[PDB]
Amino acid sequence: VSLRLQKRLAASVLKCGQKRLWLDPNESSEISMANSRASIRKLIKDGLVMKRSTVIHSRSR
Amino acid sequence: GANKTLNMKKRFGRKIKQNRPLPNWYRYKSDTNIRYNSKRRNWRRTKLKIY
Amino acid sequence: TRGTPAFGKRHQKTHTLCRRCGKATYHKQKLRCAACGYPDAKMRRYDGWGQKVRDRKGQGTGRMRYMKTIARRAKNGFRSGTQAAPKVKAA
Amino acid sequence: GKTNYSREPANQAKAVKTSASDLRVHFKNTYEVVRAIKGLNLENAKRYLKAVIDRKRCIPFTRFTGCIGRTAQAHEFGRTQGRWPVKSVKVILGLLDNLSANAQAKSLNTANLVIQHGQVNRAQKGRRRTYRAHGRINPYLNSGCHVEIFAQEVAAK
RNA sequence: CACGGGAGACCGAUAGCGAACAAGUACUGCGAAGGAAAGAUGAAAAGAACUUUGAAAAGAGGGCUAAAAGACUUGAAACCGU
RNA sequence: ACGUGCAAAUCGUUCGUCAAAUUUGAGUGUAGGGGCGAAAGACUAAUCGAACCAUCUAGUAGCUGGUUCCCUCCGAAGUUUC
RNA sequence: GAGUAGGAGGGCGUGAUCGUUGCCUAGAAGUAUUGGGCGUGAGCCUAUAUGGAGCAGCGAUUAGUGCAGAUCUUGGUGGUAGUAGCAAAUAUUCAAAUGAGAACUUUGAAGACCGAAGUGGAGAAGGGUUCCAUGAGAACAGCAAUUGUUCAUGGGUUACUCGAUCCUAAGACAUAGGUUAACUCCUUGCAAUACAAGAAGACAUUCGUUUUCGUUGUCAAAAGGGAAUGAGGUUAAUAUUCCUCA
RNA sequence: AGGUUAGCAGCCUCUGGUCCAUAGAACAAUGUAGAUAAGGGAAGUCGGCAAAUUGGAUCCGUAACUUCGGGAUAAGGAUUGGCUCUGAGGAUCUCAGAACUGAAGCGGACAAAGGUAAUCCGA
RNA sequence: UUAGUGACGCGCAUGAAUGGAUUAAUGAGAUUACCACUGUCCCUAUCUACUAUCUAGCGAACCCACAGCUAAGGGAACGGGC
Numbered sequence: 018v019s020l021r022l023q024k025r026l027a028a029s030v031l032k033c034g035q036k037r038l039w040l041d042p043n044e045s046s047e048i049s050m051a052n053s054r055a056s057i058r059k060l061i062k063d064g065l066v067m068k069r070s071t072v073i074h075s076r077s078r
Numbered sequence: 079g080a081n082k083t084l085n086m087k088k089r090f091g092r093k094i095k096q097n098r099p100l101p102n103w104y105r106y107k108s109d110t111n112i113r114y115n116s117k118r119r120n121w122r123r124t125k126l127k128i129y
Numbered sequence: 130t131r132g133t134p135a136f137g138k139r140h141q142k143t144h145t146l147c148r149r150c151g152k153a154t155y156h157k158q159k160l161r162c163a164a165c166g167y168p169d170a171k172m173r174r175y176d177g178w179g180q181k182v183r184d185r186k187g188q189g190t191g192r193m194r195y196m197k198t199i200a201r202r203a204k205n206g207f208r209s210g211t212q213a214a215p216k217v218k219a220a
Numbered sequence: 221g222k223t224n225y226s227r228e229p230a231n232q233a234k235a236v237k238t239s240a241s242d243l244r245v246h247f248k249n250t251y252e253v254v255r256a257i258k259g260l261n262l263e264n265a266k267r268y269l270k271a272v273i274d275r276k277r278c279i280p281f282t283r284f285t286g287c288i289g290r291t292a293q294a295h296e297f298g299r300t301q302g303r304w305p306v307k308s309v310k311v312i313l314g315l316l317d318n319l320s321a322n323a324q325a326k327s328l329n330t331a332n333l334v335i336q337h338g339q340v341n342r343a344q345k346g347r348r349r350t351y352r353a354h355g356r357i358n359p360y361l362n363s364g365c366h367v368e369i370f371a372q373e374v375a376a377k
Numbered sequence: 378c379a380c381g382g383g384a385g386a387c388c389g390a391u392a393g394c395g396a397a398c399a400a401g402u403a404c405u406g407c408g409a410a411g412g413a414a415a416g417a418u419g420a421a422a423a424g425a426a427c428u429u430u431g432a433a434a435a436g437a438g439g440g441c442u443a444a445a446a447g448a449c450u451u452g453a454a455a456c457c458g459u
Numbered sequence: 460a461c462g463u464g465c466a467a468a469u470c471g472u473u474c475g476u477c478a479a480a481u482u483u484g485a486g487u488g489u490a491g492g493g494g495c496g497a498a499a500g501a502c503u504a505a506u507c508g509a510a511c512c513a514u515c516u517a518g519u520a521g522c523u524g525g526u527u528c529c530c531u532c533c534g535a536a537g538u539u540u541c
Numbered sequence: 542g543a544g545u546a547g548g549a550g551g552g553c554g555u556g557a558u559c560g561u562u563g564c565c566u567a568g569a570a571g572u573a574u575u576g577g578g579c580g581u582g583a584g585c586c587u588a589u590a591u592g593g594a595g596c597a598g599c600g601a602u603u604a605g606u607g608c609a610g611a612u613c614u615u616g617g618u619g620g621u622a623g624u625a626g627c628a629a630a631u632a633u634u635c636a637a638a639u640g641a642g643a644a645c646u647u648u649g650a651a652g653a654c655c656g657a658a659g660u661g662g663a664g665a666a667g668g669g670u671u672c673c674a675u676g677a678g679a680a681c682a683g684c685a686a687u688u689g690u691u692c693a694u695g696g697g698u699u700a701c702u703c704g705a706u707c708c709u710a711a712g713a714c715a716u717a718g719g720u721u722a723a724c725u726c727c728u729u730g731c732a733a734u735a736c737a738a739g740a741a742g743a744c745a746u747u748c749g750u751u752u753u754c755g756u757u758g759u760c761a762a763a764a765g766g767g768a769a770u771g772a773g774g775u776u777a778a779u780a781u782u783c784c785u786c787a
Numbered sequence: 788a789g790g791u792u793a794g795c796a797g798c799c800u801c802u803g804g805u806c807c808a809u810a811g812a813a814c815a816a817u818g819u820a821g822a823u824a825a826g827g828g829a830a831g832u833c834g835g836c837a838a839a840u841u842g843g844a845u846c847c848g849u850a851a852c853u854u855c856g857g858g859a860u861a862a863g864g865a866u867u868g869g870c871u872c873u874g875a876g877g878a879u880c881u882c883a884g885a886a887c888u889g890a891a892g893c894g895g896a897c898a899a900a901g902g903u904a905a906u907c908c909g910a
Numbered sequence: 911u912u913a914g915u916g917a918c919g920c921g922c923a924u925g926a927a928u929g930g931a932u933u934a935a936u937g938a939g940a941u942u943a944c945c946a947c948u949g950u951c952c953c954u955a956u957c958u959a960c961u962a963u964c965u966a967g968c969g970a971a972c973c974c975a976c977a978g979c980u981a982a983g984g985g986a987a988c989g990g991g992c
């Protein structure tokens with residue numbers, strides 16, 4: 018089961034870089050079923066696809 | 079690139095159509111020796127002339 | 130370097146397609162086609178010069194829309210205005 | 221693709237034949253796996269090939285010696301050099317399996333099959349290219365296999 | 378030279394026009410110009426039903442047919458295996 | 460270093476110059492005994508002390524190489540003259 | 542009774558032609574032979590196997606008539622050899638899933654790299670469907686592959702405001718005139734080596750009529766000049782183009 | 788884009804991208820690349836080839852020669868961290884002092900000239 | 911010190927824009943010292959990565975009369991063959 022397309026679409030939808038995407042490992046088949054973008058947004062709304070917090074870069078020092 | 083003549087577009091279209099494989103049912107004719115289309119072409123290995 | 134590293138620099142193209150003969154023989158800087166010479170307005174080919182040419186481009190090389198039937202109707206006397214007629218003689 | 225085996229068995233109800241043709245495995249390697257199988261019990265051949273695959277045993281190199289590694293495993297043979305040409309072994313093994321399943325319809329017993337006549341032939345070489353310095357090109361090919369093996373039943377008194 | 382006719386102590390698929398074949402074609406060259414390789418299953422597809430082992434290619438059974446002649450007529454030598 | 464390359468000129472270190480006689484895209488002017496040259500007989504599509512393509516052209520070769528079946532018989536010259 | 546260079550006399554073997562005598566689906570040619578023989582030798586006859594349609598002798602006629610070589614032509618193959626080798630560009634690892642098969646596919650979890658002079662986001666030249674989706678046997682992706690820039694099938698490129706199209710440049714080419722056996726060649730924006738070459742208006746609204754002013758062409762810039770658009774949303778693949786709003 | 792910095796250098800990072808370059812194991816000679824050698828210091832070699840030394844900034848100090856522009860970072864001599872205070876320059880971030888503290892180290896990586904004296908050419 | 915520099919000059923064969931003599935700046939331009947410096951050397955050792963190694967997979971090329979142990983001898987005056 019390749020999710021390549023899932024991930025690209027999810028990226029665009031979330032207006033974020035692919036490496037920020039998180040596709041739930043457990044629900045993967047379900048995700049593979051998403052074809053259209055719309056499917057993707059439903060997916061994100063449902064919580065199967067999420068968007069990772071940015072890598073923390075701090076100015077303390 | 080992006081920018082093209084009509085002539086170009088049409089020529090490219092032509093060669094694009096001509097680049098199909100022999101239709102699988104032609105090989106069943108009684109008078110033909112043709113197993114395949116010998117004239118097929120791949121953009122990477124052979125280049126057209128358009129300028 | 131005259132070699133491989135040199136070849137990278139070739140994106141120019143000195144010829145384009147000649148309306149008349151349709152190869153890329155057209156010289157935009159000289160305004161002529163190296164093969165036919167499209168502007169010249171009579172076909173450029175040197176026959177004695179070198180011998181193969183006519184069999185590549187030349188009369189009979191591509192389909193001849195008009196001439197093929199000329200052979201046939203040459204013998205038939207160039208009929209104009211005639212219609213074929215039944216041997217059965219129906220009136 | 222109709223196999224003509226160069227050698228024939230004496231009793232063909234008492235024999236089992238396998239052949240595979242136009243394989244992609246290395247000739248010399250296959251050759252020597254086979255050469256090593258000749259004259260054993262089908263069950264033995266299978267055990268020992270499986271053992272080569274598991275690296276606990278070596279397939280002796282006989283005809284094609286060209287710079288082949290010396291192993292302690294070659295003791296079993298009287299030899300210095302041998303290897304573990306896995307691909308070849310797997311293919312051959314598959315062939316032995318076809319031998320055994322090939323015995324089924326015959327209603328023959330496995331225990332008394334002995335291997336006589338392995339035949340490995342150099343098949344038509346598959347062709348491709350290699351780019352060489354100065355803009356030369358040289359051939360890069362593979363030497364394919366034809367294999368055939370038949371098994372006789374021999375009764376042990 | 379073109380379209381026709383007929384013919385030959387010609388040639389007979391490395392011969393004969395370069396081309397017996399989607400041949401001035403595939404392909405190369407900015408270009409002028411260069412330019413090949415490639416013909417024969419059988420009288421008829423009857424082009425291999427079906428069983429079995431294989432993930433699959435395929436093997437073993439079994440069958441067509443005068444014959445497998447099965448991607449194909451004959452099938453030499455060099456080379457290689459038994 | 461590589462030198463049957465990654466490469467028919469590359470790779471590592473190192474080095475010349477780095478706001479001008481600087482670098483650079485396209486378009487446009489110059490073509491073969493002709494161009495073009497801060498001049499090296501340099502460059503002119505891997506071709507240059509005269510490009511490339513076809514033709515005269517199977518160019519001529521007192522010179523190099525090859526010159527295809529059997530047997531039997533006779534059997535030389537390396538000297539003379541120009 | 543020697544013999545290179547060389548010469549002579551006889552003979553062997555190969556096409557095709559005119560004759561003559563014949564052989565072959567009751568198996569010709571060709572091919573293989575550790576079968577049997579014939580010639581001093583070119584070569585021959587037979588046997589067996591294969592083969593599955595044509596052959597052969599004798600007398601002449603004719604010749605693209607005999608190959609070990611020419612760094613000979615074209616094609617096919619060896620030994621070298623499972624050898625040289627697959628080592629630039631810091632890096633991978635774990636579990637799950639999928640599959641006949643996973644170091645090389647997908648998710649997640651870790652560790653590193655390019656470090657905004659990028660291994661990022663978009664263009665011009667060049668490429669031309671390489672883009673998108675689904676599927677996948679062989680081949681190719683110099684290990685591998687369940688993966689692909691590969692194969693098969695279908696589908697994708699919407700504009701008054703972006704660019705071409707218009708303008709002029711370095712330039713260039715017609716026309717006219719002249720040169721050439723002819724082809725060709727020479728001039729032309731400061732426009733002519735040319736010149737009875739144009740434009741506009743109105744009424745008319747055709748002509749015609751009429752009036753006015755007048756020497757005569759075109760091509761060359763997808764970085765130059767250059768009338769006006771934006772944000773938001775949408776597709777698997779297009780969008781300053783489609784949708785919505787302004 | 789952030790940090791360091793004279794700096795769009797180098798080195799490290801965030802956004803975005805990527806781990807693609809066939810793999811496993813052994814660890815000999817020879818090799819390719821990378822470093823370090825006690826005592827001496829070019830004796831090596833056609834030749835200091837290669838390597839080594841030098842390197843920033845602040846303060847000192849600076850010849851012959853000259854076309855008076857130059858030479859010139861000439862040559863050479865010192866300093867550089869951390870920490871705790873002090874003073875001066877401005878609107879309605881630079882500079883200087885003092886004291887304390889360490890294996891006397893401190894341009895700690897990165898970055899970064901080795902000099903001198905002659906001879907020959909060509910400005 | 912056949913090296914470098916300064917002098918002398920019976921200059922093989924120096925000499926005036928076929929330029930002669932000078933010369934600051936200047937140089938990836940020729941040469942000689944010296945200072946610093948050092949694995950260039952005495953004199954060679956050790957450490958890292960990639961190779962060579964071995965393995966799974968993949969897999970060329972040069973070249974090749976015939977081949978491959980020597981001593982002498984003779985021989986187209988250095989044989990592998992006699």
Ligand SMILES: [Mg+2]
Nearest residue numbers: 079080081082
């Ligand atoms: Mg284009």
Ligand SMILES: [Mg+2]
Nearest residue numbers: 121122123124
């Ligand atoms: Mg290409």
Ligand SMILES: [Mg+2]
Nearest residue numbers: 122123124125
């Ligand atoms: Mg090409």
Ligand SMILES: [Mg+2]
Nearest residue numbers: 189190191192
């Ligand atoms: Mg045609």
Ligand SMILES: [Mg+2]
Nearest residue numbers: 189191192193
């Ligand atoms: Mg025609």
Ligand SMILES: [Mg+2]
Nearest residue numbers: 221222223241
């Ligand atoms: Mg076979």
Ligand SMILES: [Mg+2]
Nearest residue numbers: 350351352353
């Ligand atoms: Mg290579």
Ligand SMILES: [Mg+2]
Nearest residue numbers: 221222436437
């Ligand atoms: Mg079968």
Ligand SMILES: [Mg+2]
Nearest residue numbers: 444445446592
């Ligand atoms: Mg048969």
Ligand SMILES: [Mg+2]
Nearest residue numbers: 456457458459
């Ligand atoms: Mg043999």
Ligand SMILES: [Mg+2]
Nearest residue numbers: 469470471472
């Ligand atoms: Mg370099």
Ligand SMILES: [Mg+2]
Nearest residue numbers: 520521522523
């Ligand atoms: Mg002479």
Ligand SMILES: [Mg+2]
Nearest residue numbers: 388556557605
């Ligand atoms: Mg003939």
Ligand SMILES: [Mg+2]
Nearest residue numbers: 443566567568
């Ligand atoms: Mg019969």
Ligand SMILES: [Mg+2]
Nearest residue numbers: 553554585598
């Ligand atoms: Mg006879």
Ligand SMILES: [Mg+2]
Nearest residue numbers: 568591592593
């Ligand atoms: Mg028979």
